[PDB]
């Protein structure tokens, strides 16, 4: 098997509209944000503009192949793959993807999609100019799939590992927590990850 | 019947250009806005920038399947479905959809489409800085289908249920009213929902 | 014949690239603007930001069907139809279509496409803050079809749909037809000239 | 041959990717700018915002038809045609096409594509507020085709279509042809240099 | 073979989704930036707005043809070609491509893709108003391909050769360096080119 064959097969038979549930267990989706930059902060309106690297991981066994004498991995356009419908509940602008939209697929079926994203958020910006800093919370969850179809789980490296040293801001701490919430509109629980960003103006 | 089959059938046969009228009764569309955030208000120009959750519900029996030993629901890209052509009569910017464009389809034919939307509106903003607050009205209706083809109806959860606690504004009250209007441009009646948002600066 | 059949036939055969001329007479296209809002006015740069409903009407007999025991009308995506290539000669931004892109087709072949449009124009804004107001002229014509292929012709109240929350008010609207030859092309080109007399509200 | 047949044939034998060279002579492309408006000028940053009408003309003999008892001309979507890859070397924003994207094709093979374009340019703006005015130069050439494949050649009162409501007035427009060798490639690339002499009005 | 045939063949069979590796050696991609303009500089926020030509070059032997009595080269829409997934690590806006999206393909398989791009970057802008100027660094690498699949390499030239004389800024120097980096996220190494742009505001060089 070579890369041409593997990509042909994926394109011909991958089902980007079909959630790859196994045994009607939920698809486990790992999510972790690495912050790259904080661009604009407005303490009056409580809005922040952020660039982040959104690492997303899940299994789709329908993508698997025998890698004995073959590539162990390929890069695939996400339009050819099922991708989880993650949304940030407190976003106030659409996500602007800055990077090429390619996922990495491993022969066992694991998929890694790590786009870089610029997006505005509404959150608590008070204290950004103090020693304690502000604590901004971002909630990311599946938009239409409940906990029995998709479960999200937080995953690492330094919080500033990839954070720009030229930002006006600095990261004090990042914590990631998981939630399961029921909403009035729907019978089922929905999972989300809540990322807490503690940051301040230098 | 598995998801893959259900989604294959819907893609092969749903017809997204055809309004699913039964027995030439109008398609009943339920609409209700849940406000998430009020971002920019300009009392001088009478313009408001709003984020809201537009819950939309209707029946398309052509999507139905026998759910014995089958999923009761699937998520479907809205490009594969008929979707009502709702428009806000007093919008002054195009709707910016913030979330993944997926509708949820139930085996009986019920469709639930609930996008999160950012949009600018022209409305009465006077009094936003008083105790009584301002009352902004948004009219949403089918753009090209008259009352014999589509009827819109509001549906009744608390008003601030999903409203951001970090907005500069707070919601005092939300009411939803139904209208049937004839215009000079056309002979038939057009139904709309009028949502009244009473809000003020905190 | 039901909606599904009518829409299937139109999709299969309608020819969106072909101007529906009959007997080599020009296609008669009716155009009338209904102003909805005036958003930004700059008396210094002579630029105005307008929202308007663009009523456009013409006949395409190739879309006709026998409406005995059939719907008299359907809504059709404009990508399935021939649509006139109208352009505003004094626009300085591309038209932002705010509404669903659907035309209404009658069984006799009449088409009604009426999008809502936000667009910036360069015109005479002087006097906007006086009793007489400013008079802004917008010229709309076929971009590439001359008077033997397409003729445009203007076709109730002025402030009928004009927002009561605008900073501006409409004093008068007149619609005039022109036939112009340019230095570049030997042929003549029809346009409608819409004159908007408006001023700042007290 | 009616218009439907001509357009069917063009669409079916669409090679919009193939430059229509004959006998390995270069395709001769005529270009001339008609300025419509100058919107924003910044003497500090040396940036100008311009609206102009780009008249472009060339032969594609593969589009020809016998026009005996047939239309002499048709309008064709440019996605069905080969179009020259012209770029403005000193542009600092992407071209915003304001008008319908249709070319006019004559039965002999001549093509006429004249879009209206809003674009920002970096050029010499100094002296814009003097009697002599500023002289801004725009260079337009084929981006990837050298002089043996495409030749560009320049070809009416300078302000014939210039808006009388601009803050600026045109003193003079000259068009010059160039043939340049770059460090990147051994071959010469042709361009037209348009010189716009303009000043702030009084 | 004429142009029509060559373009038909490339369209029908070229697999824009398949990296053209030979012998499982990495695809060698050459990258060099030619700066055209620096538009907005903010010393407070450390952001710069740049226009540049991204010259990109690589071999795809699956595009080759026998050029006896045939064109030696064609222009091809990049949607019909494999193109390297380069990204600027310190970009803060998406690249705005200003030019037609066409690559030039030579009969031997060599591809040259040279788009003009406007993009905002986060980098060190301090000293932009001094004689020494600022030194802004831009790192460009393959986003998802590691060093065994894609290697990037910088291409002596004139730095200001295409730089606008009407910019508020002037280029003092440009250097291009190659890196190979391992990240905590992933076991393999990723190559990038680091381009160092030394520039300053005009006016900051007087002797009189
Ligand atoms: C169909 C749909 O949008 O369900 C919404 C679930 N929630 C509340 C997580 C967004
Ligand atoms: C075809 C069409 O746009 O009809 C308009 C109906 N209305 C007034 C609800 C928008
Ligand atoms: C092909 C073409 O654009 O002709 C232009 C006609 N005019 C002057 C009405 C725009
Ligand atoms: C392939 C390519 O972009 O060649 C560039 C020619 N030039 C310098 C006219 C833009
Ligand atoms: C799949 C993927 O995005 O890998 C990331 C490699 N890196 C760190 C160069 C961006």
Numbering used by the authors:
A (entry chain C): 1 to 155, 158 to 204
B (entry chain D): 1 to 156, 159 to 204
C (entry chain E), D (entry chain A): 1 to 155, 159 to 205
E (entry chain B): 1 to 155, 158 to 210
Which of the paper's sentences describe this entry?
Acetylcholine (ACh) is an important neurotransmitter in the central and peripheral nervous system where it mediates fast excitatory neurotransmission by binding to nicotinic acetylcholine receptors (nAChRs). A nAChR ligand-binding domain homologue, the ACh binding protein (AChBP), has proven a uniquely well-suited system for the study of receptor-ligand interactions. AChBP forms a pentameric structure where the interfaces between the subunits provide an ACh binding pocket that is homologous to the binding pocket of nAChRs. Ac-AChBP has so far been the most widely used for crystallization experiments; however, in the context of nAChRs the binding pocket of Ls-AChBP shows better resemblance as it contains all the five aromatic residues fully conserved in nAChRs.
Here, we report the crystal structure of ACh bound to Ls-AChBP. A complete data set was collected to 2.6 Å resolution and the asymmetric unit of the crystal contains two pentamers, corresponding to a total of 2024 residues built. Additional electron density for a single ACh molecule was present at all ten subunit interfaces. The ligand adopts a similar location and conformation (average RMSD of 0.04 Å between all ACh non-hydrogen atoms) at each interface and binds under a closed loop C. The C loops have a uniform degree of closure across the interface (∼7.7 Å) when measured from the disulphide bridge (C atom of Cys187) to the backbone carbonyl oxygen atom of Trp143. The ligand-protein interactions are characterized by contacts to an aromatic box formed primarily by residues on the principal side of the interface (residues Tyr89, Trp143, Tyr185 and Tyr192) but also by Trp53 on the complementary side. The backbone carbonyl oxygen atom of Trp143 interacts with the carbon adjacent to the ammonium group of ACh at a distance of 3.1 Å (3.0–3.2 Å), similar to a previous observation for carbamoylcholine. The anchoring to this side is characterized by a binding site water molecule located 3.5 Å (3.3–3.6 Å) from the carbonyl oxygen atom of ACh. In addition to the water-mediated hydrogen bonds, Trp53 is positioned to interact with the trimethylammonium group of ACh with a distance of 4.9 Å (distance between trimethylammonium nitrogen of ACh and the centroid of the benzene part of the indole in the tryptophan side chain: 5.8 Å (5.4–6.1 Å)), i.e. within the 6 Å that has been used as a rough limit when identifying cation-π interactions. At four binding sites, a PEG400 molecule from the crystallization buffer is located within 4.5 Å of ACh. Apparently without affecting the binding mode of ACh in a direct manner, when these PEG400 molecules are present Trp53 adopts a conformation pointing deeper into the binding site (light blue and Figure 3C).
